């Protein structure tokens, strides 16, 4: 057991159980470290699931995910947990981690490969302050950032140096203009403490402090856990520095938003099935995977872009920026992979990865060719995405990975949220229609 | 003695004698540690009980409750005391701790069992700043908190970070949205420093900082002492951090209030009397306990819901029982062993006096067991404090059984709560201005 | 047609068709005066009533009065609500219910032209601020004459003369801050044919005043009560102040109540007048007994506001001398003006509804020969008693069961809304407990 070993080694005082709900937000609950024993892993911990959106259930801790916490003053051990319905003593039907595990099991069952490697790069925004409110009197989402392009006048305590990136021009300034070098270094430090393998970190296209920190790969469930850990680490590092981090797909206008580019690979018995004789070194399985993604792209948009903000931001190739899918340049056949570029950081990592894998497995099973390289594209609005998912849900249900009841409930939740957004007056409507 | 041993080992300089008044607020008196001896435990300490309503009185320390104080610069030893009438030398009639002790003695006398086990879960609120007033010029009330759902625009000395739980959406955000993790950890540390065994601590459903720190079970009087100690610990930890703890049942509108669920069990020679083969593995003793709680629930609201504010929260109002149907305010929590079999009543709120509320629940359960009251498989709790006091006055029969709750104490408590109720009720509400200013 | 005569005389340019919703707040819709023809009175004017909580506006020609606040010459006509489906009065119209009450009174033969005179008190506040959200529930009153402003700051100076708490019963205008304003309100009343009887400062500080006007039949008096509310509110607005008709807008001071003097006429002879106690006939005694019997049920109509039970004169018994009695017999020099004064009704009551309820209870007592218990202490209690004792209201078809159900639903929604909010005193006590 990794948990008890870590507890003994670091003499930790608290155990922070964690899990994930339907919306993708991680959830945490703390207990004393002295409560760990064989019973704690045999029966988990009872908790109330009514108050959580989309759902008396059990947090069964995952032994393999035990990891220390670098943000709590007392030594704390973080344990990600699965969710179990006490009636059946099995993984909860609507638990995203359970859905991801079922997707992995189905991938093994079909024989297309053993485990699928997922690596997503999400981008975030590091603002100083954010003041948003939308009530009857009106709406506002004002953003305060020292390095924002529009802040070229605002006097700042301690000085207003004139160095700051322009609009769409924050792509690799030297840290005189890139204000977030030390904060990105600290985020990478916290990521490495939590067991993540940081690959690279840099500024991104947008102004106001859009950054990216790409971390290593892993299997599906492990990578969803790593994505949640990355979100937690960057959020707390920004908070400790006196700043705020946003993973919204697009918190600005004009400037490119935040996207989660997901590299995808499949291994079968130790070898890569995405390498072979084909376009840019893609085997038949890789072509069928991309064809399945293309065929069910609108259906997949319900999970990869499950937010009204995703469509304020919204083919396979190797140079063509028009293509929503990229075949990245690699040096070895084992590293050959595809890349879906449309998914956003707001997506529920477990649900998104499971849905993408299901679509790709459907494409491989049906032997669907995506045509030649670089045109059907992603859906336009969240209502359109949910409608396509509702009437295009066959591959998720097939294989017993996504249950019909879960998808209906999740569609209801996202639909009510989209209705909430869609029926509120936009200040652009004031800008264009006031003097009518 | 335990107190003398602690004094000698920790070199304490002050002894802080604490007791509880009728309203449920702890009350303390400090003396030098050098003035402790055998005679101190034999005779107690004279003190004035005129300005509390429960004439000279005696503070007799309970040596078994001696504990240290981590909130003071000087080493202080806290001792919970019993109130003794000098004329009778017995326990005081209106002493809540004496009432809880009498409830334990009555439980032993009935032969139903011994060492009844109570575990409450009093949620609370953490506010950065609270301002209220009421006079002829008007009544004002406002609560300030950085993590408030309405504070999404407010300027802060440190910036307005956009992460804060929404309305009815504070149930287990991660720390970067859950603003109160370090303060909860500090409260848990203080609880461990007073001998309590914390089991879990987390945010709660409501915004503006509703938190819950569960603590392990104990006997009736011991758990009442632990509840008072937990309230003290959370209050002082928040005050050390520049914040405040609110324990009144409903300090907000439109968001979940603070409730104190009570898990009840009864032991008998080391065996659990609630474990059986009935519904959810409940023995018929447990079923009769449920029936007794149900029948006297309206009467129980007088003691377990003494606040006129508690009924702003009870708007868990079904007086039924089930392990699945969450409408009922009496739940049979899922357990992994019959040793931990228990019932749970969810209507009590943290504003209740621990001793009085626990004794009332125990006496209701005992009356149900003795009268073999079968609950069935619908009654509701009182809608206002006036109705609760009326029902308590009408149906105090079970409380007075065995001489646990005296009629004089019940009448004094009823009078005090009625004065508070008429004070609250006959004042103008700003919603009355919202509704009637233009009539 | 009185309206056409007034239009020709005053070159009226606008017509204000006014009615009253179930909540008693007067409602008005304006149309040009050139559209007033015989067809307008014959067929009324269509309006949409699906939005008002709880058809055709048929103007009451006899109640056409000039409006003294409009910058242009404007007439005001109080209108009945008529259902287009049946061309009859709307079942949920307070004016229609009051008219049915008078019809029933005339039908039963006890008497005709019940005389109602209400004395409502109001508050004049310089400023009032309030709000109630999850953040907090705030309420504050600003008044120069307020007893709590003895050390405050004002523009141009702070004169020290202002009435104390419960000490505002007729100071002189040095301390009576609202003599000119009261005379202006009286002038506005007199400019729409309201026979003002008396006007004075009342007990409470912060500007409580009473302007008692003459008597009239029940529907006419309800129209006059709405007229008085309109005029007083608009005069306070014109003077830069505000008027509150709430039963209890303060704490630690007196409230405001609509003391209703009631009597019954019969062919010009006062039926109440007699040789019994305080010179009250047996009919008057039966009236009082019926009011006492149904008092808790009556409180739903006479005290519909939750605020009313902050103001609550609770003992429901008659006395010409005792002050705790809530049904006093005011002294009168001549026997032809013998009347009984009920003090529990408050200014937040629908005048039509309250007067109809009081009259129906009194007539029920007359018919049942009841000969002689407090008022409800909460709005929920009052609504429960009203539901329990609705029989006398539905007697004669005056108060239909459907209307009482709708009124109960509306008032219950209001009471529940005000009953689940955290009073600031609840913080004052239970914050640290």
PDB file of C-alpha atoms in Angstrom, chain A residues 3 6-18 28-34 36 65-80 193-194 232 236, chain B residues 175 181-182 184-186 188-189 201:
ATOM      1  CA  UNK A   3      -0.821   5.335   1.277  1.00  0.00           C
ATOM      2  CA  UNK A   6       3.748   7.640   2.556  1.00  0.00           C
ATOM      3  CA  UNK A   7       1.990   8.312   5.868  1.00  0.00           C
ATOM      4  CA  UNK A   8       4.811   6.645   7.789  1.00  0.00           C
ATOM      5  CA  UNK A   9       7.543   8.292   5.714  1.00  0.00           C
ATOM      6  CA  UNK A  10       6.315  11.899   5.856  1.00  0.00           C
ATOM      7  CA  UNK A  11       4.473  11.577   9.220  1.00  0.00           C
ATOM      8  CA  UNK A  12       1.450  13.197   7.610  1.00  0.00           C
ATOM      9  CA  UNK A  13      -1.421  14.419   9.769  1.00  0.00           C
ATOM     10  CA  UNK A  14      -4.357  14.583   7.334  1.00  0.00           C
ATOM     11  CA  UNK A  15      -5.779  12.453   4.530  1.00  0.00           C
ATOM     12  CA  UNK A  16      -7.551  14.440   1.817  1.00  0.00           C
ATOM     13  CA  UNK A  17      -9.927  12.190  -0.099  1.00  0.00           C
ATOM     14  CA  UNK A  18     -10.821  13.462  -3.563  1.00  0.00           C
ATOM     15  CA  UNK A  28     -12.300  16.962  -1.519  1.00  0.00           C
ATOM     16  CA  UNK A  29     -12.974  15.959   2.082  1.00  0.00           C
ATOM     17  CA  UNK A  30     -10.399  15.713   4.864  1.00  0.00           C
ATOM     18  CA  UNK A  31     -10.052  13.148   7.654  1.00  0.00           C
ATOM     19  CA  UNK A  32      -7.329  12.530  10.245  1.00  0.00           C
ATOM     20  CA  UNK A  33      -4.375  10.480   9.062  1.00  0.00           C
ATOM     21  CA  UNK A  34      -4.740   8.141  12.055  1.00  0.00           C
ATOM     22  CA  UNK A  36      -6.190   4.783   7.846  1.00  0.00           C
ATOM     23  CA  UNK A  65      -3.086   7.654  -6.416  1.00  0.00           C
ATOM     24  CA  UNK A  66      -1.738   8.545  -2.964  1.00  0.00           C
ATOM     25  CA  UNK A  67       0.376  11.695  -3.201  1.00  0.00           C
ATOM     26  CA  UNK A  68       1.548  14.390  -0.807  1.00  0.00           C
ATOM     27  CA  UNK A  69       0.031  17.879  -0.811  1.00  0.00           C
ATOM     28  CA  UNK A  70       2.410  20.863  -1.173  1.00  0.00           C
ATOM     29  CA  UNK A  71      -0.139  23.559  -0.243  1.00  0.00           C
ATOM     30  CA  UNK A  72      -1.439  22.529   3.188  1.00  0.00           C
ATOM     31  CA  UNK A  73       0.477  23.820   6.199  1.00  0.00           C
ATOM     32  CA  UNK A  74       0.281  20.460   7.935  1.00  0.00           C
ATOM     33  CA  UNK A  75       1.656  17.451   6.020  1.00  0.00           C
ATOM     34  CA  UNK A  76      -1.356  16.144   4.107  1.00  0.00           C
ATOM     35  CA  UNK A  77      -1.725  13.124   1.818  1.00  0.00           C
ATOM     36  CA  UNK A  78      -4.069  13.381  -1.171  1.00  0.00           C
ATOM     37  CA  UNK A  79      -5.908  10.217  -2.221  1.00  0.00           C
ATOM     38  CA  UNK A  80      -8.150  10.191  -5.282  1.00  0.00           C
ATOM     39  CA  UNK A 193       5.998  17.778  -6.025  1.00  0.00           C
ATOM     40  CA  UNK A 194       2.627  16.145  -6.724  1.00  0.00           C
ATOM     41  CA  UNK A 232      -5.426  22.072  -8.514  1.00  0.00           C
ATOM     42  CA  UNK A 236      -3.259  27.087  -5.630  1.00  0.00           C
TER      43      UNK A 236
ATOM     44  CA  UNK B 175      -9.317  24.385  -1.747  1.00  0.00           C
ATOM     45  CA  UNK B 181      -9.404  24.753   4.487  1.00  0.00           C
ATOM     46  CA  UNK B 182      -6.550  26.072   6.623  1.00  0.00           C
ATOM     47  CA  UNK B 184     -10.816  24.203   9.349  1.00  0.00           C
ATOM     48  CA  UNK B 185      -7.483  22.448   9.862  1.00  0.00           C
ATOM     49  CA  UNK B 186      -6.641  24.872  12.674  1.00  0.00           C
ATOM     50  CA  UNK B 188      -9.344  20.478  14.044  1.00  0.00           C
ATOM     51  CA  UNK B 189      -5.922  20.949  15.641  1.00  0.00           C
ATOM     52  CA  UNK B 201     -13.958  18.147   8.349  1.00  0.00           C
TER      53      UNK B 201
END
